């Protein structure tokens, strides 16, 4: 590198595999160092489709690692053009199977003595979802906590969870093992950086809390980390895994639609079909009433996920562990503009009660006719029955419930009569700038930009309100992977956050509001979700 | 001799007596025959009306009380005494009794006829909560009240036979009705404005009088209190009628249908009291042997099938619960409760009291009703089990077969008054924990407030002479609100849409909506297609 005398040498860094140089980012409040897009896989093409990852060889020379890398190959919505909405969730960089690599942001300089490590494991529902996006932003956490923090690609849709149980060619939960590689690539390398290998937290939301949940269940990637955060996501629910013979089934008829025709035959087969084509038929392998399942998600293999995610919380030792676990205030009204008939971003979607019953049978697809009939009787006001309002938000909750909040609940209860210091949370406040219609609240994915510290940055016009809002919850964040606990020990003015346990229950709000404990997370619904209705379903 | 209490019905004269109120006089007419005694060979059968007499008939007393079971649990407790006999034990029974004014009215006045409860197993027109007094010289009612067969000799029934075709309880108190309708006239009462009221046992009485035919031409206006002709309790099936009668047959030493009753006819009546219970499964607890039975004739179909079919435009309703229904039965049925202690009991307690309370449910109903009934932040606590416990006995029983019968009767065209019982009477012998009672509403309604020796409070007093106003209003009008009033809140009907009801108790009139409509949506529409 006959440029090296010349420029910042405060950005130069060697890692197992080489020397990289990274980049001087302007954060509000002063510079922080960014790398970015560090190889940390082989690409997964050609021969590799559906194949574990294999560790980066080392390169010679400087690697430039300036800019964010590619986006894991993966759908892209269109159901609204132009719309924030739904573009702030898209790709930013082009999509292509090469696309193992990770970030790294620190502070600027480097910290002196080592300092504990946020691991950041995106959502996207497995089917999509990116390190790079803006909403991940890695520098204000940096800057203004001096944390270290990584976030990494993973393969998602078929790429990454397309599994023919038992073969060698395509043994599923391939995803899971390029954040496992990530997680181990972090624990050789990261202290040349600043950060503390002992001291890793792992925090995601949605399918990322998910996985962060699954590491959490499989014995190989518990020695990667301390501490996790999951948020709005979990690995137990009805949407997050699947069994060896289901994932079998959904292999088998995504081949046939693209036309594959003995395990090894068929995945030689659609190893040959373009990416394209793969996205094209993902989707299709589905009743498409099971417009609330994607297709192909971690598996239950008897490896990776030893026995079910459900199986294995119920059974385990958990005295190791510190986990905050939460929910924002309507998980489910995102998901209804593209399910249930009668709902919209654009009018007030207000439903019928023949639209509440269908609605119920697409948002619990798994349900009996007796099942769908009680999830329907236990959601009805019965003093307004008809009540078109009551219907819409009923039907938002009935979704959020059974996929997110009451899987959050069973998970928040075992970990804490399982021995783990757990802690609750509900995020109730509405982004000023959210420009999803308002009867959606506070919708799934929409606490992820006020961890991340964004409305610190004046240019994207939050409140200033809102300003020290996100600086309570970076710190919030931060001291819990600091400390395992989220309190700030220096500060007995302000309320303290307790632990989350199977006798008093309690968890806090997050609003502009000082935090507020209260008891019981969603208690009574979710005893009906997680205990009853398991019979007739 | 007074002319006032010299009254001339169609079978004979009769002597009353000249009874006081706080207020003043009344004029009672205490014993008077309305049938032929169900003796003998009249057992189990149909009454037939009182032959004429001779003479002037004393009617000062009180006659003697249905053949019954006799209540031991409690012996002396002023709690339980309080609904026991307080006349001895006949098969002669067959007498009602009459309150008035004193004068006797002017004018032709609304008659409320009076139907006592006690599980169509029990109960007197004579106990001191019936007492007809304060109602007539308060409000200046005709109260009337009747004695009916109970027990087996109520309802004993081998459907289909001529000589115990069922229900003979219901139609003693048909003919009282009829009795009404001749005579009533006589002490100033109005044959054309006849209301029915009745608690528990009582009230499911009067409902099915609603959904007989025969009964509808004598009444013209109905008061149910805590308690239904639909529900688990009130009525059997013609083939269960059959079995339990059979068995209890064979129990006494008995023996074809004409042979069978023969032989029961002969049997002393301690000796059917004494059999009459153990003639069904012991889960049944919460169930008596003998009770109205669908027969085809008095009950042309069950009770609901009725409720959700028929026309009731020209019939005006009022109906209502207390707030805590089912506690008076646990101490007598579910293990770790009592008078005596709170009853804190364990969950192991409550899941297995569940299986009482529901006796009829599958595992899966059972295991519904427990983790429905439960509080989920403090699922252990006992003041919180026992709570629930109660308010599974009395929601499934009571409360929800009341709010289902309120919304089919609105619905289909009847004008219904809606309320729920709050006010604890501060004389109440039971323990704090069962809050307002099983039963304890009656005395406030019969004005027994009103006599000072009673030590009921001020506030009591006035508490009762509204409920009073209420209940004569609705005689009166169909309508329990006053037609030139207190100007307090009105009392709304309820409707299938609004579901208003009100609050009783010493605060103003309270209007709410939703009768436990979450709890009870859980009844009556989802529990059922669970043991299906
Ligand atoms: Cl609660 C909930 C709602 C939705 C959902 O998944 C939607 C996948 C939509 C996948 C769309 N797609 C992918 C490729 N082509 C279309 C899942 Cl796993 C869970
Ligand atoms: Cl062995 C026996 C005796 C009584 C009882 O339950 C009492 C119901 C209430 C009896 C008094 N009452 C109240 C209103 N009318 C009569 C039960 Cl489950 C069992
Ligand atoms: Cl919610 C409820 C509670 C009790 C009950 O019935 C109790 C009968 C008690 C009979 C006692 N007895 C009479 C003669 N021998 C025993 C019924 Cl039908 C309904």
Redesign the interface.
């Known amino acids: 590198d006959p440029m090296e005398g010349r420029e910042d040498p405060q950005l130069l860094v060697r890692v197992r595999g080489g020397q990289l140089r990274g980049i001087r980012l302007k954060a509000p409040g002063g510079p922080v160092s960014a790398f970015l897009g560090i190889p940390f896989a082989e690409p997964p093409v050609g021969s590799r489709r559906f194949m574990p990852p294999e560790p980066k060889r080392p390169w010679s020379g400087v690697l430039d690692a300036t800019t964010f890398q590619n986006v894991c190959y993966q759908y892209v919505d269109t159901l609204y053009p132009g719309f924030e909405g739904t573009e702030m969730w898209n790709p930013n960089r082009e999509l292509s199977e090469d696309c193992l690599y990770l970030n790294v942001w620190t502070p600027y300089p480097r910290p002196a003595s080592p300092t504990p490590v946020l691991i950041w494991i995106y959502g996207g529902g497995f089917y999509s979802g990116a390190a790079s996006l803006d909403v991940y932003d890695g520098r204000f956490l940096a800057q203004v906590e001096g944390a270290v923090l990584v976030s990494m690609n993973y393969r998602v849709g078929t790429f990454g969870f397309l599994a023919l149980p038992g073969s060698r060619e395509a043994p599923g939960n391939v995803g899971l093992l390029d954040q496992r590689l990530a997680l181990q690539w972090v624990q050789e390398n990261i202290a040349a950086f600043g950060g503390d290998p002992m001291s890793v937290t792992l925090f995601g939301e949605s399918a990322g809390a998910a996985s962060v949940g699954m590491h959490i269940l499989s014995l190989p990637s518990r020695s990667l980390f301390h501490r996790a955060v999951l948020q709005s996501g979990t690995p137990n629910g009805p949407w997050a895994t699947v069994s060896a013979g289901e994932a079998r089934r959904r292999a088998t008829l995504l081949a046939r639609l693209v036309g594959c025709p003995n395990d090894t035959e068929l995945i030689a087969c659609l190893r040959t079909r373009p990416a394209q084509d793969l996205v094209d038929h993902e989707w299709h392998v589905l009743p498409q009433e099971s417009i609330f399942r994607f297709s192909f998600v971690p598996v239950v293999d008897g490896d990776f996920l030893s026995d079910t995610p459900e199986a294995l919380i119920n059974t385990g030792d958990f005295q190791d562990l510190q986990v905050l676990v939460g929910v924002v205030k309507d998980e489910g009204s995102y998901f209804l503009v593209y399910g249930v008939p009668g709902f919209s971003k654009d009018n007030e979607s207000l439903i019928s009660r023949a639209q509440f019953l269908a609605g119920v049978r697409i948002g619990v697809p798994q349900a009996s006719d ?1 099942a769908a ?2 999830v329907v ?1 236990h959601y ?1 006001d ?2 307004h029955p008809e009540d078109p309002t009551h219907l819409r938000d009923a039907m938002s909750a009935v979704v959020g419930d059974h996929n997110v909040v009451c899987p959050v609940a069973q998970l928040a209860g075992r970990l804490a009569a399982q021995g783990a210091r757990v802690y609750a949370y509900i995020f109730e406040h509405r982004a000023s700038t959210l420009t999803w219609p308002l009867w959606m609240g506070v919708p799934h994915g929409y606490e992820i930009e006020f961890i991340f510290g964004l409305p610190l940055d004046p240019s994207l016009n939050y409140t200033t309100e809102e300003r020290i809002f996100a600086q309570r919850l970076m710190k919030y964040w931060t001291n819990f992977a600091r400390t395992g606990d989220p309190n700030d020990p220096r500060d007995s003015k302000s309320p303290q956050w307790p632990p989350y346990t199977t006798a008093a ?1 309690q968890y806090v709000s997050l609003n502009l509001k000082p935090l507020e404990v209260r ?2 997370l969603r ?2 619904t979710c ?2 979700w997680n ?2 209705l398991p ?1 007739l379903l």
């Open positions: 007796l009939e009680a009787l009805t019965w003093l229950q008891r019981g208690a009574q005893a009906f205990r009853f019979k």
